[PDB]
Amino acid sequence: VKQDSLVINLNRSNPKLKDLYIRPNIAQKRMQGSLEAHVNGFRFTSVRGDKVDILYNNIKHALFQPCDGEMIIVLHFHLKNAIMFGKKRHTDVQFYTEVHDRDDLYAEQMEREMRHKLKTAFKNFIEKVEALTKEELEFEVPFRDLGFNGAPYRSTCLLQPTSSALVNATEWPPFVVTLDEVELIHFERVQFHLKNFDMVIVYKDYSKKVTMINAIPVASLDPIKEWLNSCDLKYTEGVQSLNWTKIMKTIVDDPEGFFEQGGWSFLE
């Protein structure tokens, strides 16, 4: 999908954040640069002179991950339509900065001051951008204490709710699902003396493949249910596991037939 050209107005103070790594890479090695907010989008300029443009109206989610409990601080953009750079197609682009009783007290103080400085710099950039777009671009911060551990791809990571998404932006590839795009959640392997369970995210659009989050500790089941309840996202649980690849194909081929024969009540 062709993007609007970036409009730059130099008779204006354009908000700028420096010392940012872009992920995914533009070059063969990772590279730092500056992120500048312009009239209708962002431009990232690498130290090598590479330019990456992100138009505001191509941003589905703008995420702010503070360094609290992490070793990086991140601006993450989940895009409506994939863009090309580094000779590849990308639906996500982010920008981050890395972060004896006495020597420990020394360390604590430096850490707290460093983290405060970075967080303030990022927040100030965000507030400028939100004003410049007249609140039409709004950054979401995750709610860490609503988070839970699970493995969407290979290894376990922290998944955190924002107001409008379920996210992980510290590991790559990232994880972003839009809550209002979700049809239902189905928990699997909820049985017995459960140590962990799986969480299936089914989308309202049945042509989208389901999202599996594997191996979530059982202690997180009730907190997740309460969170889902707050979002008005319906959940069910089963003891065994369903073939979602086959099920979604069957539904996609004929959703009217699916609903005539009971729809999602088979989970109930």
Question: Does residue 96 share a domain with residue 57?
Answer: yes
Are 84 and 185 contained in the same domain? no
Residues 63 and 179 in one domain: no
220 and 254 together in one domain: yes
Distance, in Å, from the CA atom of 111 to the CA atom of 114, rounded to the nearest integer, reads 5
Q: Could you tell me what percentage of the chain is helix, strand and coil, using 3-state DSSP and rounding each to the nearest 5?
A: 30, 40, 35
Q: Is the dihedral of CA 244, 177, 84, 208 positive or negative?
A: positive
136 and 9 co-located in one domain: yes
Dist. CA 264–CA 17, nearest whole Å: 47
Give the bridge partners for 73, in sequence order. Answer: 97
> What is the number of domains present in the chain?
2
Checking 132-138 for CB contacts under 8 A at 24+ apart, the result is 132/15, 132/37, 133/56, 136/56, 137/56, 137/59, 137/62, 138/62
**CB < 8 Å & 24+ apart, contacts of 147-155:** 148/216, 148/217, 148/220, 148/223, 148/224, 149/216, 149/217, 149/220, 150/199, 150/213, 150/214, 150/215, 150/216, 151/213, 151/214, 151/215, 152/211, 152/212, 152/213, 152/214
The backbone region for 13, taken as left when phi is positive above 0, alpha when psi lies in -120 to 50, beta otherwise, is beta
Question: Residues with Cβ < 8 Å from 267, sequence gap 6 or more?
Answer: 184, 186, 236, 238
Give the end of a domain, one of 121, 140, 159. 140
Q: Which residue in 61, 119, 71 sits closest to 93, CA to CA?
A: 61
Contact 167, 174 (CB under 8 A): yes
3-state secondary structure of 263: helix
Method of determination is X-ray
85 plus 201 within the same structural domain: no
- Are the beta carbons of 124 and 103 closer than 8 angstroms? no
C-alpha span between 18 and 200 (Å, rounded): 39
Asked if 156 and 165 touch (Cβ cutoff 8 Å), the reply is: no
Contact 41, 22 (CB under 8 A): no
Closest listed residue to residue 61, CA positions, set 74, 77, 47:
77
Pair type for strands 41-46 and 51-55:
antiparallel
Which of 118, 140, 162 is where one domain is finished?
140
Based on the domain organization, do 87 and 4 belong to the same domain?
A: yes
Show which of 114, 140, 166 is a domain's final residue: 140
Provide the CATH number for the domain around residue 51.
2.30.29.150
What are the residue ranges of helices labelled H in the chain?
A: 101-132, 221-230, 244-253, 255-260
Quote the domain boundaries for residue 63.
1-140
Is there a single domain that holds both residue 79 and residue 36?
A: yes
Say how far apart CA 59 and CA 76 lie, in whole Å.
10
Cis peptide bond upstream of 173, omega within 30: yes
* Cis ω for the linkage preceding 24 (within 30 of 0): yes
Which of helix, strand or coil describes residue 123? helix
Query: What is the experimental resolution, given in Å to one decimal place?
Result: 1.9
Query: Which two structure tokens, joined as six digits, stand for 166?
Result: 């379920």
Q: Taking a C-beta distance cutoff of 8 angstroms, is the pair 58, 83 a contact?
A: yes
Which DSSP letter does residue 251 get? H
CATH number of the domain bearing residue 167:
2.30.29.30
Q: What is 32-61 written as a DSSP string?
A: EEEEEE-SSEEEEEETT--EEEEEGGGEEE
